[PDB]
Scaffold this active site. Sequence first.
Site, PDB file in Angstrom:
ATOM      1  N   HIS A 213       6.986  -2.236  11.835  1.00  0.00           N
ATOM      2  CA  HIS A 213       7.564  -3.650  11.100  1.00  0.00           C
ATOM      3  C   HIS A 213       8.914  -4.090  11.820  1.00  0.00           C
ATOM      4  O   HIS A 213       9.288  -5.053  11.454  1.00  0.00           O
ATOM      5  CB  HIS A 213       7.510  -3.411   9.427  1.00  0.00           C
ATOM      6  CG  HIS A 213       6.031  -3.011   9.187  1.00  0.00           C
ATOM      7  ND1 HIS A 213       5.049  -3.500   9.120  1.00  0.00           N
ATOM      8  CD2 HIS A 213       5.906  -1.690   8.267  1.00  0.00           C
ATOM      9  CE1 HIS A 213       4.018  -3.042   8.443  1.00  0.00           C
ATOM     10  NE2 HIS A 213       4.545  -1.934   8.020  1.00  0.00           N
TER      11      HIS A 213
ATOM     12  N   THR B 293      12.704  -6.641   0.632  1.00  0.00           N
ATOM     13  CA  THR B 293      11.896  -7.631   1.206  1.00  0.00           C
ATOM     14  C   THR B 293      10.502  -7.358   2.122  1.00  0.00           C
ATOM     15  O   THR B 293       9.981  -8.335   2.406  1.00  0.00           O
ATOM     16  CB  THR B 293      12.816  -8.299   2.268  1.00  0.00           C
ATOM     17  OG1 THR B 293      13.215  -7.455   3.306  1.00  0.00           O
ATOM     18  CG2 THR B 293      14.153  -8.798   1.473  1.00  0.00           C
ATOM     19  N   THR B 294      10.210  -6.202   1.886  1.00  0.00           N
ATOM     20  CA  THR B 294       8.760  -5.907   2.165  1.00  0.00           C
ATOM     21  C   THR B 294       7.960  -5.033   0.936  1.00  0.00           C
ATOM     22  O   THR B 294       8.573  -4.623   0.001  1.00  0.00           O
ATOM     23  CB  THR B 294       9.079  -5.017   3.383  1.00  0.00           C
ATOM     24  OG1 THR B 294       9.589  -3.414   3.088  1.00  0.00           O
ATOM     25  CG2 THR B 294       9.551  -5.481   4.659  1.00  0.00           C
TER      26      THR B 294
HETATM   27  C1  LIG Z   1      10.920  -1.392   6.294  1.00  0.00           C
HETATM   28  C2  LIG Z   1      10.123  -0.360   5.606  1.00  0.00           C
HETATM   29  N1  LIG Z   1       9.931  -1.036   4.197  1.00  0.00           N
HETATM   30  C3  LIG Z   1      10.626  -0.529   2.973  1.00  0.00           C
HETATM   31  C4  LIG Z   1      10.655   1.090   3.369  1.00  0.00           C
HETATM   32  N2  LIG Z   1      11.534   1.720   2.164  1.00  0.00           N
HETATM   33  C5  LIG Z   1      10.965   1.605   0.651  1.00  0.00           C
HETATM   34  C6  LIG Z   1      10.466   2.956  -0.005  1.00  0.00           C
HETATM   35  C7  LIG Z   1      11.177   3.467  -1.011  1.00  0.00           C
HETATM   36  O1  LIG Z   1      11.990   4.465  -0.814  1.00  0.00           O
HETATM   37  C8  LIG Z   1      11.009   5.819  -0.355  1.00  0.00           C
HETATM   38  S1  LIG Z   1      13.143   1.602   2.497  1.00  0.00           S
HETATM   39  O2  LIG Z   1      14.134   1.847   1.285  1.00  0.00           O
HETATM   40  O3  LIG Z   1      13.585   2.251   3.688  1.00  0.00           O
HETATM   41  C9  LIG Z   1      13.344  -0.258   2.668  1.00  0.00           C
HETATM   42  S2  LIG Z   1      14.777  -1.207   2.464  1.00  0.00           S
HETATM   43  C10 LIG Z   1      13.768  -2.434   2.950  1.00  0.00           C
HETATM   44  S3  LIG Z   1      14.755  -4.136   3.281  1.00  0.00           S
HETATM   45  N3  LIG Z   1      14.039  -5.067   4.223  1.00  0.00           N
HETATM   46  O4  LIG Z   1      16.083  -3.610   3.680  1.00  0.00           O
HETATM   47  O5  LIG Z   1      14.536  -5.073   1.953  1.00  0.00           O
HETATM   48  C11 LIG Z   1      12.512  -2.296   3.210  1.00  0.00           C
HETATM   49  C12 LIG Z   1      12.025  -1.171   3.126  1.00  0.00           C
HETATM   50 ZN   LIG Z   2      15.178  -5.245   5.729  1.00  0.00          ZN
END
Ligand SMILES: CCN[C@H]1CN(CCCOC)S(=O)(=O)c2sc(S(N)(=O)=O)cc21
Ligand SMILES: [Zn+2]
Lengths: 250, 250
Positions: free
Chosen positions: A66, A189-190
């Site tokens: 992604h 945002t995902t």
């Molecule tokens: C891109 C991978 N998708 C998620 C993955 N993770 C969410 C899992 C919860 O924690 C185990 S993440 O905390 O590393 C994070 S921050 C964002 S964003 N675009 O900065 O809003 C997206 C994501």
């Molecule tokens: Zn992001």
Amino acid sequence: WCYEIQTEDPRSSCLGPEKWPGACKENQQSPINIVTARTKVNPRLTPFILVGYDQKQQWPIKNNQHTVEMTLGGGACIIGGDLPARYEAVQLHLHWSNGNDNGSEHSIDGRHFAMEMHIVHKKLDKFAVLAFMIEVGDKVNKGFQPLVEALPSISKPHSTSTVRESSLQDMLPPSTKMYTYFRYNGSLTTPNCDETVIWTVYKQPIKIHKNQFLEFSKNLYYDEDQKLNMKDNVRPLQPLGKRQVFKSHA
Amino acid sequence: WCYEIQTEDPRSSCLGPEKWPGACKENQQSPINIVTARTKVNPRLTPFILVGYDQKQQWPIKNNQHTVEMTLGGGACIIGGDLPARYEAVQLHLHWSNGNDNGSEHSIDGRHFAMEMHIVHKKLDKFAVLAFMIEVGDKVNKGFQPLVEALPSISKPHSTSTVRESSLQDMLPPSTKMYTYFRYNGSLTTPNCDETVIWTVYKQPIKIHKNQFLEFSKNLYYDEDQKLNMKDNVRPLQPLGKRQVFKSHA
Ligand SMILES: CCN[C@H]1CN(CCCOC)S(=O)(=O)c2sc(S(N)(=O)=O)cc21
Ligand SMILES: [Zn+2]
Ligand SMILES: CCN[C@H]1CN(CCCOC)S(=O)(=O)c2sc(S(N)(=O)=O)cc21
Ligand SMILES: [Zn+2]
């Protein structure tokens, strides 16, 4: 799940932004469009104390299918900025497209930039994500060079690699340019779009050369068969709802 | 006025620390000896937000007849650390001797270091002076190299000069080593000893090579005729009085 650009292939189909699993359809989603003329000032929004940003070391990176993920593994920490507790740097990634005016998820006054960088911090609220706007310039950015060079080696999804001796600090704008930013409560945002994120979007953008920028879409791929380059990994504007956006300056 | 070492010459005599003009004999003078086991913790003592410390530029230096002065001319600024307002970097100087155990004005638990650095900030309370302990090491300090090279050109008092492209940041210990420090109200360590200074003394010392250290006493002179090298420009311990010394860590 996947972005619009990925549903374009008649063969196979997944959940585009339109059908992302539960929670992505909630009352407080990100990204949003920052309307400066309507932002409230909050004196407490004093610049962050950046810990571990000056350390130089090798950074493990990987194409997670992604975006380009760079593991910071708690090496850095941030304090202040009216945050409830201290947060540590976990990962860093980016969102881009093919033009220099519509690759950033957020937008400031109806203006989207070339790229947008996201440095994620886990609560040591829950996530403190620092977002920086990137703009294409006519000069090379030495700070970003290390990251660009490792791109050709992580073409296909799930490929592991490493970035040469570099520090987070050299990738950001000068400390004197980090006074003005915007704060607001939001979500990832995902998927699954957990609304446990405190967003800090900085006004001053980071400039990188047009050739450094092109390297992302050229080397990165969404699929195993390398038929679709990686770009347009951006989620569309989400309604502001009833949230209030603050700014550090008056 | 002058230090003890300068009164040693039978020919001519000035006001040694013993006879420094009014105010130097007051109830709250600096330096003092920090007794760690008796310091009170204050959570508010959160690390400083260092602004303009990452900027690289030429620095005008000069021998002011008492030390090596390096003009920072408001290029840098500091915020936080439970300071009342924001302060800007004005100048930077040092205090040393000929040994590696008795050149620092302050002392932590009856221990004096090789040198002591003072980065003075004017209130934008009144003066916020950051003091760093320096210790002689078996390795060269690239960050201090620029300053050492300009020494041979400012031998005699009042000589002007300039330091090559360098930044304040590279002269200090890593940001992760600036968590522990000590706070206390005090005064200038030289006449007229105005008690309008907020002191912050850091625990972690800066290490410089034995050869870099020797350059100070070798090139710098107190007098026009260059008969007395510069060293022992240190004021003796002042009584703690009734003041209370705090620390950032628990
Ligand atoms: C891109 C991978 N998708 C998620 C993955 N993770 C969410 C899992 C919860 O924690 C185990 S993440 O905390 O590393 C994070 S921050 C964002 S964003 N675009 O900065 O809003 C997206 C994501
Ligand atoms: Zn992001
Ligand atoms: C070394 C020159 N002697 C004074 C000069 N200045 C005092 C004049 C008031 O301001 C106009 S100063 O503020 O640059 C300063 S800070 C110290 S110290 N050793 O850090 O305690 C000494 C001094
Ligand atoms: Zn001093």
